[PDB]
Amino acid sequence: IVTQTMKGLDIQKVAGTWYSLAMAASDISLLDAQSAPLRVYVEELKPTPEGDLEILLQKWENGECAQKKIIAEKTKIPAVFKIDALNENKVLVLDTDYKKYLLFCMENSAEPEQSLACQCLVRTPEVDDEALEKFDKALKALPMHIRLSFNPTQLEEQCHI
Ligand SMILES: CCCCCCCCCCCCCCCCC(=O)O
């Protein structure tokens, strides 16, 4: 689905702290409740030396904010990782400048029109208008039906409460 990938991605340089400033999905149900399936809040990226990606994040489940750890495995495409879970879940890095913003989408492997969610990550708990502008331009193709964004207070709280 996603026709935008970052050329020349250096996965080591995305290490460190990130904030999920905005999210969007193809289906309202993927993001509507606090416990919605792709309502996830990125905490940090931890690239391994072989070039896989450990992801720390928070997710609300059963009435509280839970910390999760995910391994995205590398593929032959530098910008595309596989989540390793039951669903053939692919993560694509659309664009990043390493020091300010990273845009990524995650999609299901097939069925036929399928689930897709994308986030605008930023390095600091600040509304970055230019990064949100790149996020919205990246998505104006994609068939999104829900979009969320968060204010700096929420960005400093667990599960953006
Ligand atoms: C590649 C650099 C960008 C960072 C990508 C972050 C991708 C989160 C992927 C999370 C997928 C959904 C997790 C669902 C909760 C875990 C579970 O229920 O098993």
| C-beta atoms surrounding 62 within 10 Å | 6
- The matching CATH number, chosen from 3.30.420.10, 2.60.40.10, 2.40.128.20, 3.40.1280.10, for 1-161 is 2.40.128.20
Pocket lining: 55 vs ligand 1, CB cutoff 6 Å: yes
Instruction: Give, for ligand 1, the residue of 46, 68, 71, 75 to mutate: max count of ligand atoms closer than 8 Å to Cβ.
Output: 68
Question: How far is ligand 1, taken at its centre, from the CA of residue 40, in Å?
Answer: 7
Domain range annotation of the chain: 1-161
User: What gap in Å lies between CA 51 and CA 72, rounded to an integer?
Assistant: 10
User: What gap in Å lies between CA 116 and CA 99, rounded to an integer?
Assistant: 26
CA nearest to 128, candidates 39, 18, 48, 25: 18
Instruction: Indicate which technique resolved this structure.
Output: X-ray
Indicate the helix (H) or strand (E) that contains 44. Answer: strand 41-47
Pocket lining: 103 vs ligand 1, CB cutoff 6 Å: no
